Amino acid sequence: NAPKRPPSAFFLFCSEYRPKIKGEHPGLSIGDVAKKLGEMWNNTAADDKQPYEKKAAKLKEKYEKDIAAYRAKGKPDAA
């Protein structure tokens, strides 16, 4: 029922690095270490974006369609 926004390229990255920066930053929050990632991703390894992208992309892509397909109907239910 009603799909819920999968990863965003940066989401993969976020997960992978949180505990590394946090690793040395056991004083930050998932609001600051998050801000760090928030930026590092832009200015990450541009060739590392590629894998992250193909994954988040595939998942969100499905979503937008199945969502569009779960909205198109429900109420008019006459095509």
Q: How far apart are CA 21 and CA 12, in angstroms?
A: 15
3 exposure class (CB count in 10 Å sphere: 0-12, 13-18, 19+): middle
What is the Cα–Cα distance from 2 to 18, expressed in whole angstroms?
Answer: 29
Say what angle helices 33-40 and 10-24 make with each other, to 10 degrees.
Answer: 130
* Structural domains of the chain, count: 1
The parent domain of residue 64 ranges over 1-79
Q: Looking at residue 13, which CATH number applies to its domain? A: 1.10.30.10
Tokens of 41: 């991703």
CA distance readout (Å), 73 to 5, 13, 16, 59, 65 = 20, 35, 38, 22, 13
4: which residues sit within 8 A by CB, 6+ positions away? 63
